[PDB]
């Protein structure tokens, strides 16, 4: 795995006429249906890993929607910037996802705001809506997925399924997110 | 009257600045005019925690009236006190004699079993209850417990 | 200036800027994804230690791995170190040049030397860092200094 | 400043025509005006009336007068939308689409209200979305649709034909309580009487454009018998491509 | 105060801010209120 | 990237200084282990090193938990087979399928309830294993030694009593017949260490 | 001697989240731009104007469960016990009265019964009614109002 680097001319050459990666993958999996191949494994990985570039993405933007309460109005231009700017440094590894999360809770919203809160919430869980819309929306106006809708289904899909699952919205700390020690 | 535009209803808002400037970075004029622009739009400029029932108001809508039919444009303190005296002379059942909410001054004791308390400390308590002090019709020959 | 910043200009892009000042553009592989394109600056490598530890995968098999320790510099304000356990020495070489440069650290030098002392320790390695005329160390922390 | 100018006034110039005297009971009308807004705003329900994509300041051209146009958007609509507000909360029907409350309160008794309501609250955001201020030319592939059906040998005869088809359904609803739609049966057009308190989504039509036979529309302009004329005035003043690209949706 | 009774009668009580507030319409309530379980501590340095 | 921050391409990332000197703990622990496995420092399932953790003593009784398979097992019908039993042992002259209608019923529905439970556990483990299991890294609380410092903090007490002296110290114990065997002048009742 | 499992690769319970706090960051990488030799990643770009909260704290070097180190992922009831007491006690003598405003998800621009009911409550009490019969007011202003309603509703 070691990253190309761009070069001269043959390489942007090769950036240029490049092409869908996602649906080249696709091809190459299915075309172990024509008569002279077999389906190979290795070929759905392939396919499977382009698929899931992103993925780790999602799900921390997934974090961000449903693992804060009161994360003031998403839809403000203020809190918006915030999280559009940590999104696309979760993406791009120049973060990790602890980090971009412990900065997206301890970032700057408003003079004594619980208190200001206290005029809106009772225990202060605000509603899940303006965030999804605008966790949907950062993915879109950042360029995060070459087909448009994969980044409003996957982080809707996501939400889904754990909605059904005993104390879905809270997480031990160490194993929500990246550190030594892992979840299978 | 448009004397000043900003207010709250937040609990010692002094503390709530402090901790607020400090948390702010810069010092460019571009920096500080959001700053303090953000702390006033938040708390200061009254939207949605707001109404007109709520803010105090000692010349409300009515008081207005009166006022502008006695002191609007009396040219000395005697018009002034001619006009009153004969506005005070009005009956209860004239058009012009125009009634409003007055605002009740608070009692001391809110309540009158508070009253009764209130005066209980200036007076002695009887051991016994007023239903029970009289004697019984029948006869309690009085033992040891 | 807590959050000075820096270098803004994106008249090329950032992979043309690295390619050009940097060495480190060479070895792609060396570098963590957030460093990628980020330096402008080379980088002297100055491997300190190798050495052999036995690695035991099962109880028949033994492995032999080897154990770099090194530390990545440029005398331009900006150090790291890494260490690693790999089976082979380049290996064990590229390992900890990856992670010397996932530690990066980076001094401030309008100062030029420590203003107060730092009292400091590592494990079991007590460390002072004092003001002085000149630079004075062992020869080696010396040119880490 | 916009925020601040209480809702009906208009922000304008100074020309300093003004007196104290008027000028301090603009001021009163101004702290009155706070005062009831203050009360709309919790008396505020689920639902509520369309934005107009039109300035209706002045009257709907060719059409309406301001104060016909008014008299319906600020008074029996308002009101309609006040009666579904009070109906639709403390029931089943809390907080769903303007749909789902049409749709499942439809053909019954002890839910009439609600539906009623909100069959009404429909018809009339459809009637201002059906009106373009100025009018519009009918599109081209509408013109064809239209022309297989209606048409009798003759140009563009469809048109005619349906903005007289259109007159004759109206007239020959007497009750002058309702709505008269160009719908899309999903097999081929026609136009449908609808009495009040009835929507083509109820029926599950697919709505191309409405026409307001309330009497109640044409009464304070065209008078009590002038409704000829006001249908006449409405295909001057009607929205031909939104009843396209509903067509065109409806169909694929 | 010997006199300040003119001042007293179109004088001005002094306006319920809390139960105002109290009483806003809320986004977070709920038809029966359920007090949250108990959050985790720090045990210390061997626990967590 | 492709993998996880606390796993590199040799085995697990050696963070502290124990790794770099013993790095067999790096790649190994027990015979469950594979590459992918590491940094998950628990095993499939079913399968060798699996367990969850609590207070780092690890859970092995979990069908014990939902009353599958324990000797305290949660029984389904009990009146049913006592009453066939009843029947059975009553006469030979009357015959009844009547009651044993009832009972394989009662199986017959027990089947499905069985299957239930056992899958309604296995996502207690998973459960589990998430938000409560410490995954082995937190020290023993199930034996008296673990507890020491408290005990400590009470011999303590039972010195300071003693004017701060005789630690870890108890009375001497007596006879069975103690008091009554002895002569006047002698103690009768086991006093106070200190108070020897 | 016997130890727990993975205790090898046991975390540092207290200091864990040095590393990853965002403060950290920010000062690291506020030396690492200001050399000259570093292209500041955006966030930097970013957080330069907006650095984060002061005071918020990890429970690890303050030892203390109570201290709310979060003003966002804060939870503390805005009700007062006697709050709760009253609303939940008028929720429990009508089920209508609870649900109304939220059925289903919670419909939060509407002025909600409940609400309403405890505001009329407390005016109850100010002009003297006692608790019960103020109660029992209330909830009777609340039902006549629906019974005109629905009462119109069958006419
Ligand atoms: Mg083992
Ligand atoms: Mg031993
Ligand atoms: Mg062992």
Redesign the interface.
């Given at each position: 795995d070691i990253p190309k680097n761009l070069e001269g001319e043959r390489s942007r050459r090769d950036l240029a006429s490049r092409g869908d990666t996602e649906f080249q993958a696709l091809v190459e999996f299915i075309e172990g249906a024509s008569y002279d191949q077999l389906i190979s494994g290795r070929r759905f990985k392939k396919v499977y890993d382009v698929l899931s570039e992103n993925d780790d993405m999602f799900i921390w933007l997934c974090h961000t929607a449903m693992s804060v309460l009161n994360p003031g109005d998403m839809r403000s231009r203020l809190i918006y910037n915030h999280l559009r700017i940590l999104a696309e440094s979760v993406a791009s590894g120049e973060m990790t996802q602890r980090t971009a999360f412990r900065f997206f809770e301890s970032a700057?919203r408003?003079?004594?705001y619980r208190?200001?809160a206290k005029?809106q919430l009772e225990g202060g869980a605000a509603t899940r809506l303006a965030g999804i819309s605008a966790a949907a929306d950062v993915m879109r106006r950042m360029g995060l997925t070459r087909r448009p809708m994969s980044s409003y289904f996957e982080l809707y899909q996501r939400i889904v399924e754990r909605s059904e699952a005993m104390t879905p919205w809270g997480f031990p700390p160490l194993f929500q997110f990246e550190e030594r020690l892992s979840l299978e | 009257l448009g004397w000043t535009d900003l207010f709250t209803?937040?609990?010692d808002?002094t503390y709530?600045?402090k901790?607020?400037f400090?948390?702010t970075?810069?010092m460019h004029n571009d920096?500080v005019a959001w700053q303090l622009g953000?702390?006033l739009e938040?708390?200061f400029k009254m939207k949605?925690?707001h109404?007109?029932?709520?803010?105090?108001?000692?010349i409300t809508?009515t008081?207005?009236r009166w006022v502008?039919d006695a002191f609007a444009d009396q040219p000395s303190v005697n018009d002034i006190m001619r006009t009153l005296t004969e506005i005070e002379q009005l009956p209860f059942q004239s058009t012009h004699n125009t009634s409003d909410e007055?605002?009740?001054?608070?009692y001391t004791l809110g309540?009158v079993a508070a009253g009764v308390q209130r005066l209980g400390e200036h007076r002695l308590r009887y051991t016994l209850s007023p239903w029970d002090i009289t004697p019984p019709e029948d006869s309690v020959v009085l033992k040891h417990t | 200036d807590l959050?000075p910043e820096g270098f803004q200009w994106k008249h090329k892009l950032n992979t043309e800027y690295n390619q050009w000042r940097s060495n480190t553009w060479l070895t792609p592989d060396l570098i963590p994804k957030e460093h990628r394109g980020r330096f402008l600056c080379n980088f002297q490598l100055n491997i300190v230690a190798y050495d052999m530890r036995v690695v035991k995968f099962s109880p028949k098999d033994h492995r032999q791995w080897i154990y770099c320790v090194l530390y990545v510099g440029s005398g331009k304000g900006i150090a790291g170190w890494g260490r690693a356990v790999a089976p082979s020495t380049q290996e064990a070489k590229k390992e900890a040049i990856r992670e010397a440069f996932s530690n990066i650290i980076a001094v401030d030098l309008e100062q030029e030397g420590p203003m107060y002392p730092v009292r400091v320790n590592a494990d079991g390695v007590r460390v002072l860092l004092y003001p002085a005329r000149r630079i004075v160390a062992n020869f080696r922390v010396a040119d880490i200094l | 400043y916009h925020a601040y100018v209480p809702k009906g006034a208009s922000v304008q110039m100074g020309e300093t025509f003004m007196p104290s005297n008027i000028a301090?009971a603009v001021f009163?009308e101004t702290?009155?005006a706070?005062?009831r807004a203050?009360k709309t705003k919790e008396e505020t329900g689920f639902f509520s009336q369309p934005r107009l994509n039109y300035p209706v300041s002045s009257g709907i051209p060719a059409l309406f007068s301001k104060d016909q146009f008014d008299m319906q958007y600020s008074l029996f609509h308002r009101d309609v939308v006040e009666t579904l507000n009070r109906h639709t909360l403390g029931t089943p029907l809390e907080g769903h689409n303007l749909e789902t409350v049409i749709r499942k309160t439809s053909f019954d008794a002890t839910q009439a209200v609600a539906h009623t309501a909100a069959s009404e609250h429909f018809n009339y955001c459809f009637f201002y979305k059906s009106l373009r201020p100025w009018g519009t030319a009918p599109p081209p592939r509408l013109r064809e649709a239209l022309q297989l059906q209606y048409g009798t040998n003759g140009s563009a005869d469809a048109m005619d034909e349906v903005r007289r088809i259109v007159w004759v359904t109206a007239a020959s609803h007497q009750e002058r309580c309702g709505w008269v739609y160009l719908v899309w049966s999903g097999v081929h057009f026609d136009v449908v009487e609808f009495p009040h308190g009835s929507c083509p989504i109820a029926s599950d039509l697919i709505p191309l454009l409405a026409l307001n036979v309330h009497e109640s529309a044409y009464i304070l302009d065209y008078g009590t018998s002038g409704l000829k004329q006001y249908v006449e005035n409405y295909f001057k003043a009607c929205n031909w491509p939104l009843a396209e690209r509903y067509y065109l949706m409806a169909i694929g | 105060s010997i006199y300040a009774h003119a001042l007293?009668?179109?004088?001005?009580?002094?306006?319920?801010?809390n139960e105002?507030?109290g009483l806003?319409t809320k986004q977070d309530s709920t038809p029966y209120h359920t007090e949250p379980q108990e959050k985790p501590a720090y045990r210390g340095r061997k626990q967590g | 990237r492709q993998h996880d921050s606390g796993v590199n391409q040799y085995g697990l990332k050696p963070t502290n200084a124990y790794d770099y000197i013993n790095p067999t703990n790096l790649i190994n622990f027990g015979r469950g282990t594979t590459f992918d496995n590491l940094g998950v420092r628990r095993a499939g399932r079913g399968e060798i090193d699996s367990s969850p953790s609590h207070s780092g003593s690890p859970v092995f009784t979990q069908a014990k938990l939902i009353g599958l398979s324990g000797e305290e097992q949660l029984t389904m019908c009990q009146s049913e087979t006592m009453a066939l039993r009843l029947c059975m042992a009553k006469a030979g002259k009357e015959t009844c399928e009547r009651e044993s209608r009832a009972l394989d019923s009662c199986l017959g529905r027990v089947g499905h309830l069985r299957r239930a439970m056992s899958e309604a556990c296995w996502e207690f483990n998973d459960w589990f294993i998430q938000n409560v299991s410490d995954n082995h890294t937190k020290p023993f609380q199930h034996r008296p030694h673990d507890w020491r410092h408290f005990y400590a903090q009470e011999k303590l007490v039972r010195e300071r009593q003693q004017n701060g002296h005789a630690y870890g110290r108890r009375p001497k114990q007596f006879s069975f017949g103690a008091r009554y065997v002895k002569t006047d002048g002698y103690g009768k009742r086991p006093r106070l260490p200190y108070n020897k | 001697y016997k130890m727990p499992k993975n205790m090898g690769v046991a975390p540092r319970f207290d200091t864990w989240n040095e590393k990853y706090e965002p403060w950290e960051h920010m000062k690291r990488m506020g030396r690492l731009v200001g050399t000259g030799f570093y292209i500041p990643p955006e966030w930097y770009n970013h957080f330069?104007?907006?650095?984060?909260?002061?005071?918020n704290f990890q429970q690890e070097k303050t030892l203390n469960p109570h201290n709310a180190s979060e003003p966002t992922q804060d939870d503390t009831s805005t009700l007062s016990p006697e709050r709760v007491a009253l609303r939940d006690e008028l929720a429990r003598k009508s089920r209508l009265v609870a649900s109304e405003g939220m059925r289903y998800y919670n419909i939060f621009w509407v002025r909600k019964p409940l609400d309403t009911m405890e505001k009329e409550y407390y005016e109850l009490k100010r002009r003297?009614v006692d608790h019960g019969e103020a109660i029992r007011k209330v909830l009777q202003g609340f039902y006549s109002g629906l019974a005109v309603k629905k009462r119109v509703a069958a006419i």
């Open positions: 700057v408003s003079p004594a208190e200001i005029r | 209803t937040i609990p808002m709530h600045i901790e607020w400090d948390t970075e810069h920096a953000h702390l938040t708390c949605e925690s109404s007109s029932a709520m803010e105090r108001a000692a809508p008081r207005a502008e007055s605002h009740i001054t608070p309540s | 959050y | 301090t009163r702290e009155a706070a005062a203050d | 007293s009668q179109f004088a001005v009580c002094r306006q319920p801010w105002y507030i806003l | - | 330069r104007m907006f650095p984060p909260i002061n005071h003297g």
